[PDB]
Design a protein around this ligand. Structure first.
Ligand SMILES: O=C(O)c1ccccc1NC1CCCCC1
Ligand SMILES: O=C(O)c1ccccc1NC1CCCCC1
Lengths: 158, 157
């Protein structure tokens, strides 16, 4: 129905969507200001890690400091094949994408990293309150020259 | 308030109920969950150590995979289920946890728990593609398999 309440929702979703698009398109030196898309207490980071705990960077300033590390370790990164998923919550979006670029981790050789990613974006007052990255860490191991364990699934059909 | 829209609301409402069903299926009822797919529907695990998905294609093969699944994960349950509707009436995401016993040939019996994202794409009110995404490292752990530790050396605190 056409109500101002439903209109508010649409406008919120629409404004939020444009921020997701901006996030996912941010490259190079622009990455250093991408923290400004977050709430002051906003959280970002990697939720699928070998340790099992997330790497959660908390706060708009700590996120800016994190961008400096990210830009050196992933200097030429690009997200590709971006699919943005609005949800029934005008403040909650999912993104399915790929990404590729060099990976430069001290104590490993320079590598080429490619992976499939899912990102979660939750909003508050039109800024990002919580960004979470989900990927398969095994592809990151490969990129680092780290041997990947193999699970044998005997009986799996076929 | 067009029929165009009503049609989709209907599809989305219908499809959401099938996502709820899938996610709430336990026990012996797992052996018939393949029936919620299209005849040519695909399900399986998209985050593997090998880097390639384990994709099970067709209702028949899915029904066969359920027998495997019920042996290897005899008491599996999904919890903390959050279902996300999308702008596409035939596309849902689910974020959830899951846990249960893991009983694979050649590994010690373990307790497996993980965080999961599932994608469900529909055709004609049935599941045309279901995809599970998780962290394979937690499954390694469940089986006693060593997980390497990635060092991120100048990562700020
Ligand atoms: O992949 C990582 O090691 C990682 C660590 C903390 C935060 C995010 C991380 N993932 C991003 C780093 C920049 C884009 C490519 C992957
Ligand atoms: O986790 C697995 O090894 C697996 C392999 C093929 C298809 C699906 C898989 N994951 C499901 C198996 C059934 C219990 C919950 C996780």
């Amino acid at each position: 129905e056409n109500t101002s309440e439903n209109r508010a929702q649409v406008a919120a979703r629409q404004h939020n969507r444009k921020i997701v698009e901006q996030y996912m398109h941010t490259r190079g030196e622009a990455r250093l200001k991408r923290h400004l898309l977050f709430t002051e207490d906003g959280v970002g980071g990697l939720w699928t890690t070998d340790s099992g705990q997330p790497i959660a960077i908390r706060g708009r300033e700590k996120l800016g400091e994190h961008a400096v590390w990210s830009l050196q370790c992933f200097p030429d990164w690009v997200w590709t094949d971006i699919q943005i998923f609005e949800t029934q919550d005008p403040n909650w979006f999912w993104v399915e994408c790929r990404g590729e670029g060099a990976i430069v981790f001290p104590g490993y050789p320079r590598g080429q990293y490619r992976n499939h990613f899912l990102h979660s974006f939750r909003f508050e007052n039109g800024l990002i309150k919580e960004q979470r990255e989900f990927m398969n860490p095994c592809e990151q191991f490969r990129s680092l020259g780290i041997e990947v364990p193999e699970v044998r699934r005997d009986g799996l059909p076929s």
